[PDB]
Amino acid sequence: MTESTLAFVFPGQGSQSLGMLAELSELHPQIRETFAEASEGAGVDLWALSQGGPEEMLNRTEYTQPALLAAGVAVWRLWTAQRGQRPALLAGHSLGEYTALVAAGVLSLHDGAHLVRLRGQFMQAAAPAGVGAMAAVLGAEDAVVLEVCAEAAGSQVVVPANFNSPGQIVIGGDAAAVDRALALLAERGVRKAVKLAVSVPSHTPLMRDAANQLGEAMAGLSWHAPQIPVVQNVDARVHDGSAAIRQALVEQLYLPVQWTGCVQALASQGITRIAECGPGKVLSGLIKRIDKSLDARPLATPADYAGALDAWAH
Secondary structure: OEEEEEEEEEOOOOOOOOOOOHHHHHHOOHHHHHHHHHHHHHOOOHHHHHHHOOHHHHOOHHHHHHHHHHHHHHHHHHHHHOOOOEEEEEEEOOHHHHHHHHHOOOOOHHHHHHHHHHHHHHHHHHOOOOOEEEEEEEOOOHHHHHHHHHHHOOOOOEEEEEEEEOOEEEEEEEHHHHHHHHHHHHHOOOOOEEEOOOOOOOOOHHHHHHHHHHHHHHHOOOOOOOOOOEEEOOOOEEOOOHHHHHHHHHHHHHOOEEHHHHHHHHHHOOOOEEEEOOOOOHHHHHHHHHOOOOEEEEOOOHHHHHHHHHHOOO
């Protein structure tokens, strides 16, 4: 039935690549069928975009989001059809939380794809290119980064946007303020700090109004009871009922992703095995840093998929 030790996690912005899932698609016709279904909701051919580009559009968040949602749901449908063990819990990183809700049966794939295209649009409009920035800070203490953000802000916004693992925090906000934070980190000795290519300062106060727009978009859709609980990013908790799940998604947009917290919450609930259900191996890398005992495996490629399917055989 359900495997009590297994969770699935779904990747978000940053995990996309040209040709993602190409090799799995060659083996499994369901993959392109899932993209076609998602594409109807999104208003764009997500398979064509993800395989052929243009990469510039694929990397623009209003497109990346439905593309990655389609990708995670495609791998989910493959695993579930091929008799992989059913996970007892789900989570996902930012966009990935929506992928999790589709996997849980809360939203249809059509609606999920439509919703995250809108989510990306609202986010992009909140911070037109040039306005926002994000930066990863590696190997520092959380406290150092948090005090630096407060000191750098001035009249602008710079805040922790992702708690990704011990020694990985992403900060975000106004471009000038992120740059000031980077300067202060540099004068404090913290060198491993790289500005990300993303133009959108997700999970910062600059998304507050976009979050309200998101809330209105969500309320026009049909929400179903989850078949598998979803540990949500805003507070690393499962939320009960439509109103609470949606409120946690609204809050998610302008508050930090508690990725460390979500993984710790999974582990505290008896999870020992985690599949990364979608492209890349980013979450698997974070998980290995958060809790070295967890068996974290990507499913993005034929060999990794087959390896997981075999090692966790039911």
